Design an enzyme around this catalytic site. Structure first.
Site, mmCIF file in Angstrom:
data_model
loop_
_atom_site.group_PDB
_atom_site.id
_atom_site.type_symbol
_atom_site.label_atom_id
_atom_site.label_comp_id
_atom_site.label_asym_id
_atom_site.label_seq_id
_atom_site.Cartn_x
_atom_site.Cartn_y
_atom_site.Cartn_z
ATOM 1 N N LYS A 65 -6.437 12.469 -13.285
ATOM 2 C CA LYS A 65 -5.035 12.376 -12.897
ATOM 3 C C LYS A 65 -4.152 11.866 -14.020
ATOM 4 C CE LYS A 65 -5.583 9.473 -9.380
ATOM 5 N NZ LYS A 65 -7.071 9.455 -9.380
ATOM 6 N N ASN B 81 0.873 6.027 -9.801
ATOM 7 C CA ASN B 81 -0.425 5.362 -9.820
ATOM 8 C C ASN B 81 -0.946 5.119 -11.229
ATOM 9 O OD1 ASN B 81 -2.779 4.519 -7.962
ATOM 10 N ND2 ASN B 81 -3.790 5.956 -9.360
ATOM 11 N N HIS C 40 -13.122 5.579 -2.570
ATOM 12 C CA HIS C 40 -12.330 4.829 -1.591
ATOM 13 C C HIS C 40 -12.908 4.899 -0.186
ATOM 14 C CE1 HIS C 40 -9.667 3.820 -4.700
ATOM 15 N NE2 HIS C 40 -9.319 5.073 -4.931
HETATM 16 C C1 UMA Z 1 -4.944 -0.236 -5.073
HETATM 17 C C2 UMA Z 1 -3.778 0.559 -5.574
HETATM 18 O O1 UMA Z 1 -3.343 1.529 -4.959
HETATM 19 N N1 UMA Z 1 -3.231 0.116 -6.709
HETATM 20 C C3 UMA Z 1 -2.058 0.700 -7.310
HETATM 21 C C4 UMA Z 1 -0.820 -0.161 -7.012
HETATM 22 O O2 UMA Z 1 -0.999 -1.422 -7.633
HETATM 23 P P1 UMA Z 1 -0.492 -2.724 -6.860
HETATM 24 O O3 UMA Z 1 -0.680 -3.900 -7.750
HETATM 25 O O4 UMA Z 1 0.867 -2.492 -6.310
HETATM 26 O O5 UMA Z 1 -1.567 -2.730 -5.673
HETATM 27 P P2 UMA Z 1 -1.458 -3.367 -4.216
HETATM 28 O O6 UMA Z 1 -0.981 -2.339 -3.245
HETATM 29 O O7 UMA Z 1 -0.730 -4.653 -4.353
HETATM 30 O O8 UMA Z 1 -3.010 -3.635 -3.913
HETATM 31 C C5 UMA Z 1 -3.788 -4.325 -4.899
HETATM 32 C C6 UMA Z 1 -5.015 -4.952 -4.278
HETATM 33 O O9 UMA Z 1 -4.622 -5.984 -3.330
HETATM 34 C C7 UMA Z 1 -5.250 -5.751 -2.088
HETATM 35 N N2 UMA Z 1 -4.282 -6.151 -1.057
HETATM 36 C C8 UMA Z 1 -2.993 -5.674 -1.105
HETATM 37 C C9 UMA Z 1 -2.071 -5.995 -0.188
HETATM 38 C C10 UMA Z 1 -2.422 -6.885 0.879
HETATM 39 O O10 UMA Z 1 -1.668 -7.309 1.759
HETATM 40 N N3 UMA Z 1 -3.734 -7.321 0.856
HETATM 41 C C11 UMA Z 1 -4.698 -7.005 -0.061
HETATM 42 O O11 UMA Z 1 -5.830 -7.449 -0.002
HETATM 43 C C12 UMA Z 1 -5.520 -4.245 -2.065
HETATM 44 O O12 UMA Z 1 -6.474 -3.857 -1.105
HETATM 45 C C13 UMA Z 1 -5.972 -4.034 -3.508
HETATM 46 O O13 UMA Z 1 -7.318 -4.475 -3.679
HETATM 47 O O14 UMA Z 1 0.365 0.460 -7.477
HETATM 48 C C14 UMA Z 1 0.378 0.778 -8.881
HETATM 49 C C15 UMA Z 1 1.684 1.505 -9.118
HETATM 50 O O15 UMA Z 1 1.814 2.693 -8.325
HETATM 51 C C16 UMA Z 1 -0.846 1.595 -9.255
HETATM 52 O O16 UMA Z 1 -0.839 1.753 -10.669
HETATM 53 C C17 UMA Z 1 -2.132 0.921 -8.808
HETATM 54 O O17 UMA Z 1 -3.205 1.802 -9.133
HETATM 55 C C18 UMA Z 1 -4.429 1.139 -9.456
HETATM 56 C C19 UMA Z 1 -4.741 1.383 -10.912
HETATM 57 C C20 UMA Z 1 -5.559 1.685 -8.602
HETATM 58 O O18 UMA Z 1 -6.669 1.155 -8.653
HETATM 59 N N4 UMA Z 1 -5.287 2.744 -7.848
HETATM 60 C C21 UMA Z 1 -6.331 3.399 -7.078
HETATM 61 C C22 UMA Z 1 -5.735 4.065 -5.851
HETATM 62 C C23 UMA Z 1 -7.094 4.423 -7.931
HETATM 63 O O19 UMA Z 1 -6.583 4.793 -9.000
HETATM 64 O O20 UMA Z 1 -8.185 4.790 -7.491
#
Ligand code: UMA
Ligand code: A1AQS
Ligand code: A1AQS
Ligand code: CL
Length: 431
Positions: free
Chosen positions: A115, A138, A183
């Site tokens: 991606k 992402n 996932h």
């Molecule tokens: C997990 C995910 O979707 N991460 C993406 C996200 O980062 P962000 O820091 O905002 O993540 P988040 O939604 O706060 O979640 C981060 C972590 O906290 C955990 N979390 C989050 C919220 C909450 O109430 N409780 C909790 O436990 C989540 O399950 C996860 O383990 O938003 C960013 C901007 O769009 C992305 O760059 C980032 O991709 C990372 C690199 C990722 O790992 N993405 C996954 C989907 C992937 O690529 O496979």
């Protein structure tokens, strides 16, 4: 969309949540923010006027909301968030908020592997054409930070999680590059539930770009295709990129290598063509792009040993792309470990036979990874322990490959930190 006067609740105090806080405040709306983590990474970056709740979801706030903005890291299936949905409370994510405000065409890219490479390539194709392009999602730059009235094209990397909360995307060109298990901790109905989330990317897309070699990328029910030996965009073997039988690029001019990167190039070109970008500048960008940090990145080549940071290999399919066809003169020292997200690691085993492979397995699921071939495997708690264990065994001709097949969150801030720590240790131990 108009949010004035609404009670807005954001779930997640990470990168996405902070970007959403700024978005609402700049539009005259003070949101509230919650996160199930007690001490989330954004806790101390939050503006002082914003109420925050950590350690759980707050049902008083959710059930009072006019709009819930869910970061991709919270499952819609969380009981509190599901209860809000049952009550008819609107739930969106940051990508949805973005689509409601963006005023330029969007190229949208998902898939289990490739991606960020394809996203960045399309961005470079746009830059080479002189187009004002915003690249994010992402890949790491939250999409809301891209919004710019002068932007002429947006290129968004989208995850399945982001797609689950998005309803207003009408991409000029959209692709699912491939679908391989990932996932599963978030998809209790398995691979097809994960796939269904990704299939949302095609809804209302002007052009859909599918992988002719991966049937799961195709809509369940008129798409352009890319593939190796078939597809509108395909390879001709020296290797050439072709479109409908016409050679367009000898891949010796690319800086990337490997068949999966050649199909990434095909997908990027198909998306760029669909977005109306000129072919000549798109082809030029394929020859200038050098790769991304943490994606099969040589961080040290010294004394006959290559140390490769592939920390972005966060699932089995990505590690398979590193291993399939990999040439090593001596021994491959392979680092595997972290949070496997309930994946079946067994597809990796067919690459791990023979006398020239050693496994160094760490993190939450280290034992499961070592079970792939116990007789050549060592297990440690941490990546640093694994590196200090393997380094005395490295000989000229060997490769040390961090391609861990797992998420990093059990031990690291992000996969970048894992890759940076690997690079620092490689330099210490290998030079
Ligand atoms: C997990 C995910 O979707 N991460 C993406 C996200 O980062 P962000 O820091 O905002 O993540 P988040 O939604 O706060 O979640 C981060 C972590 O906290 C955990 N979390 C989050 C919220 C909450 O109430 N409780 C909790 O436990 C989540 O399950 C996860 O383990 O938003 C960013 C901007 O769009 C992305 O760059 C980032 O991709 C990372 C690199 C990722 O790992 N993405 C996954 C989907 C992937 O690529 O496979
Ligand atoms: C079924 C169909 O034809 N879908 C479609 C999708 C995207 C475009 S390009 C475009 C340009 C400006 C803009 N502003 N908001 C949005 N979604 N766009 N999209 C054209 C057609
Ligand atoms: C041919 C095939 O396999 N199609 C398919 C499509 C979607 C799913 S996902 C799903 C299925 C039931 C269900 N019940 N509640 C929830 N949340 N789900 N989710 C699975 C299979
Ligand atoms: Cl990660």
């Amino acid at each position: 969309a108009d949010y004035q006067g609404k009670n807005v609740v954001i779930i997640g105090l990470g990168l996405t949540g902070l970007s959403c806080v700024d978005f609402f405040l700049a539009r005259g709306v003070t949101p509230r923010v919650m996160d199930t983590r007690m001490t989330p990474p954004g806790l101390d970056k939050l503006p002082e006027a914003v109420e925050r709740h950590t350690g759980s979801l707050n049902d008083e706030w959710l059930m009072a909301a006019d709009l819930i903005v869910a970061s991709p890291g919270i499952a819609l299936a969380h009981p509190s968030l599901s209860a809000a949905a049952d009550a008819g409370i609107e739930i969106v994510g940051d990508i949805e908020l973005f689509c409601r405000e963006a005023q330029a065409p969007i190229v949208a890219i998902t898939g289990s592997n490739g991606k960020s490479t394809v996203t960045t390539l399309v961005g470079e194709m746009a830059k080479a054409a002189g187009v004002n392009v915003g690249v994010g999602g992402n890949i790491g730059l939250p999409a809301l930070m891209l919004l710019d009235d002068e932007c002429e094209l947006y290129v968004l990397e989208l995850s399945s999680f982001q797609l689950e909360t998005t309803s207003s995307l009408q991409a000029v060109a959209a692709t699912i590059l491939n679908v391989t298990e990932d996932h599963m901790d978030r998809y209790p109905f398995g691979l097809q539930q994960y796939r269904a989330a990704k299939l949302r990317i095609y809804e209302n897309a002007k052009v859909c770009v599918v992988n002719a070699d991966d049937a799961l990328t195709m809509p369940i029910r008129r798409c352009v295709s890319f593939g190796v030996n078939m597809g509108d965009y395909h390879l001709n073997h020296e290797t050439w990129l072709r479109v409908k039988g016409e050679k367009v690029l000898n891949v010796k001019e690319m800086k990337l290598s490997g068949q999966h990167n050649y199909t990434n190039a095909l997908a990027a070109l198909a998306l760029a063509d669909a977005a109306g970008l000129p072919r000549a500048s798109s082809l030029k960008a394929l020859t200038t792009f050098t790769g991304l940090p943490h994606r099969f990145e040589v961080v040290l080549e010294h004394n006959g040993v290559r140390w490769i940071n592939d920390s972005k290999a966060t699932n089995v399919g990505s590690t398979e792309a590193a291993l399939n066809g990999l040439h090593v003169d001596g021994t491959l020292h392979l680092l595997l470990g972290g949070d496997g997200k309930s994946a079946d690691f067994s597809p990796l085993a067919r690459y791990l036979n023979g006398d020239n492979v050693r496994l160094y397995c760490f993190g939450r699921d280290g034992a499961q990874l070592a079970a792939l071939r116990p007789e050549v495997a060592e297990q440690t708690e941490t990546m640093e322990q694994a590196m200090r264990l393997l380094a005395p065994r490295v000989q000229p001709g060997d490769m040390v490959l961090l391609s861990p097949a797992c998420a990093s969150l059990d031990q690291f801030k992000n996969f970048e930190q894992r890759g940076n720590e690997f690079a620092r240790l490689a330099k210490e131990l290998g030079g």
